[PDB]
C-alpha cells in the first residue's frame, strides 16, 4: 500500500484492478514546524537597581524595609554585575530566581564592615546581628554583599554609619529597633545622663582607606520572599520568541495555546481588546502583545488525498489531488504541478483545449487520459 499512490488506491478499494475515476486514499495534513511564544513587554520593572545604586544606604540597626510588587524583577543584571562578593541564598536557588516568583518581595539595605558581614545570616549569632538585624532560620531569600571601601571610607574617618551593640534582648527577625535611648547596663539608673554604669548603645564605625580585608566597609542587602493566597502581581521576565508569519506554527499568545498559521490582517481591534472570535466562537485573530498589530490566525491546511487514475487495464499512471491545499507547501511535488480551486494536481498536465468531462475533479476541472 505504501509503495505508490496506485497501490494505496488498490488497498483502499481492496481490488487489484481499479476502474477509471478519482479515489480518496489518505488525508493530507500539515504538522506545525515550530512553536512561537510571545508575552507582553516588561513595562513595570522592580526598582532593585536604585536600591543597589543608592548613594547612602540605611543604617544597620535602622535598615530600610520596602515592599515591592506590581512589577517585573530582573535578576539577570544582578548576576551580570561583578561587584557582589557574597551572594549566599537561603531556601531558594539563585538560578531559579527568574523562573519562579512570589507574591511580595521585601528588601533590606545596610552597611557593615568586612568581618561582620558573616554575622548577618540566618541561624547565626553575632555582636551586631542580635541588636541590629536578625534573620529567621526558616527564612527563604538571598543575601547580597559587596565591597564599598572607596565610597564608605575616607582618610579622616567615616563616622556617618552607625550600629547598635547593647540592648536588653535581641531584636526579633524582620523587626527593626531605632531607639536612641541611653542603655542601663548598670544597676544605677541612667536618667538620660552618661556615667560609669551607662554607655551609649549606639556607636559610629571608624573607616580608613587602608583597613584591609575584613575591616573595610561592605554594602550588604538582604531580600525576602514569601507567598500569599492573594494573586501575585510581581514575577520575573518571561521568554519571548521572534514573530513568524505565513508558517504553520504553535502560538501561545498569553494562553491561546493554539495551532495555526499567522498572517497580517486588516481587522482593527478596540484598544482594550486582545482576542478575536468568529460566529462559531473559535479564535480567529489575536493581537501581538509586543507590537500593536492584528494577526489573523487561519489554521493549518488539511484535506483529503485523492488519486486520479484511469483503468489499470488502460494504463498504470496516477495524478494526485490535494484537496483545498495551496501546494506551495506539501507522487512527489514538482512534477507537472497544476493549481485549481478544488486543490492542485501533481502529475497532471493542464491543457487549454476543452473536452467532455472524463474524471470529475471539481470546480469544472476534469482529468482524462489522452495524448
Amino acid at each position: 500500500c505504501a509503495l505508490d499512490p496506485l497501490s494505496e488506491t488498490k488497498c483502499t478499494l481492496k481490488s487489484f484492478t481499479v476502474e477509471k475515476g478519482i479515489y480518496q486514499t489518505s488525508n493530507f495534513r500539515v504538522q506545525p514546524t515550530e512553536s512561537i511564544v510571545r508575552f507582553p513587554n516588561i513595562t513595570n520593572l522592580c526598582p532593585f537597581g536604585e536600591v543597589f545604586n543608592a548613594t547612602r544606604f540605611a543604617s544597620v540597626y535602622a535598615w530600610n524595609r520596602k515592599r515591592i510588587s506590581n512589577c517585573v524583577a530582573d535578576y539577570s543584571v544582578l548576576y551580570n554585575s561583578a561587584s557582589f562578593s557574597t551572594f549566599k541564598c537561603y531556601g531558594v536557588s539563585p538560578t531559579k530566581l527568574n523562573d519562579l516568583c512570589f507574591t511580595n518581595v521585601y528588601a533590606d539595605s545596610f552597611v557593615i564592615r568586612g568581618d561582620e558581614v558573616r554575622q548577618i545570616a540566618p541561624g547565626q549569632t553575632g555582636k551586631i546581628a542580635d541588636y541590629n538585624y536578625k534573620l529567621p532560620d526558616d527564612f527563604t531569600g538571598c543575601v547580597i554583599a559587596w565591597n564599598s571601601n572607596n565610597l564608605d571610607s575616607k582618610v579622616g574617618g567615616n563616622y556617618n554609619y552607625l550600629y547598635r551593640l547593647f540592648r536588653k534582648s535581641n531584636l526579633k527577625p524582620f523587626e527593626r529597633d531605632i531607639s536612641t535611648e541611653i542603655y542601663q547596663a548598670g544597676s544605677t539608673p541612667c536618667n538620660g545622663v552618661e556615667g560609669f554604669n551607662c554607655y551609649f548603645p549606639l556607636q559610629s564605625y571608624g573607616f580608613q582607606p587602608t583597613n584591609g580585608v575584613g575591616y573595610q566597609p561592605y554594602r550588604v542587602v538582604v531580600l525576602s520572599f514569601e507567598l500569599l493566597h492573594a494573586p501575585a502581581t510581581v514575577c520575573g521576565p518571561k521568554k519571548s520568541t521572534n514573530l513568524v508569519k505565513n508558517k504553520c506554527v504553535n502560538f501561545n499568545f498569553n494562553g491561546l495555546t493554539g495551532t495555526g498559521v499567522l498572517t497580517e490582517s486588516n481587522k482593527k481591534f478596540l484598544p482594550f481588546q486582545q482576542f478575536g472570535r468568529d460566529i462559531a466562537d473559535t479564535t480567529d485573530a489575536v493581537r501581538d502583545p509586543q507590537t500593536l498589530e492584528i494577526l489573523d490566525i487561519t489554521p493549518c491546511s488539511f484535506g483529503g488525498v485523492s488519486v486520479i487514475t484511469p483503468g489499470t487495464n488502460t494504463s498504470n499512471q496516477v495524478a494526485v489531488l490535494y484537496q483545498d491545499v495551496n501546494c506551495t507547501e506539501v507522487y512527489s511535488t514538482g512534477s507537472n504541478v497544476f493549481q485549481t480551486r478544488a486543490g492542485c494536481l501533481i502529475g497532471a498536465e493542464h491543457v487549454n483545449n476543452s473536452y467532455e468531462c472524463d474524471i470529475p475533479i471539481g470546480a469544472g476541472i476534469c482529468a482524462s487520459y489522452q495524448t
Partner: antibody, heavy 116, light 112 residues
Framework: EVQLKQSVAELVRPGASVKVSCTAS????????MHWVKQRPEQGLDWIGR????????RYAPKFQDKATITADTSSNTAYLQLSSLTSEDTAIYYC?????????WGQGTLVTVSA | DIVMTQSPSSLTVTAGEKVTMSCKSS????????????LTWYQQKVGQPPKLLIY???TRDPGVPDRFTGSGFGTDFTLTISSVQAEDLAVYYC?????????FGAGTKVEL
Amino acid sequence: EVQLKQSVAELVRPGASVKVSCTASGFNIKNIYMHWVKQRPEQGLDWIGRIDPANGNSRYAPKFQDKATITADTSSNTAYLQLSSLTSEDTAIYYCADEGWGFANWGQGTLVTVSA
Amino acid sequence: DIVMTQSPSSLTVTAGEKVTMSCKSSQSLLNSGNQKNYLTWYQQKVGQPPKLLIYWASTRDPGVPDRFTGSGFGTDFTLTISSVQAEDLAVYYCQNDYSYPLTFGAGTKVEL
C-alpha cells in the same frame, strides 16, 4: 534552618530497582532543582546528575548516563532517585544538594549496599 | 568532563602551622561578567557530608572562618590555612562549577 532528610538506607538486590527519596524543610522543591551525588568509599567523590521539579530534563554525568535515572516530584517536598544494574562498585554513600554556588545542603547520608 | 587533581593529597603538620596545598584546574574556569572563578572548596570530615568551605574561590562561608582565602585566575587555586585545629583535621574537596559536567577533586588529607 534548612535541612535535607533523605530516606534511610535499605538493602537491595542485584538487577532490581531502588528509589531514594530526599525530603526538605523550611521551603518547597518548586524553587529548588536539587542535584544528586554519590560518594564512592576510599575514592574521589563523583557527581551523578541534575534534575528539575518542572521540566526535569535530567542531565547526568557521562559515566552515569542511561544508568541513573532521577525524577522530581512536584509536591510532597520529595524527589526520587532510581537506580538499576547495581554492582559491588555501586555500594556507596549518597547525598542531596541545594544547587547553590556549591551544594549548599547535603543529605544525612544513605549507605546503599547490594548483596545476597 | 574536566580532570581534577589535588596535590599532594597527603601531608602532615604540627598544630598551628601553615599548610600549602593546591589543586590544579584545567580548562581555565572563567565566566563572563563576573570575574569570580566557579570553583568551590569543601570541608569533609569522617561521619558527615561535606560542607562549603569556600565558594566563588574567594568567599568565607559562615562558621569557623579562619582565612581559607584563595588566589587564582582559574588555572590554579590555593587553600592555604595559617593554623590548623580539630575542625581543620578533615579532607578538602575542590570542585568546578562553570562547566556543566562537573567532577570533584581527589581530596587532600591533613592532620595535626
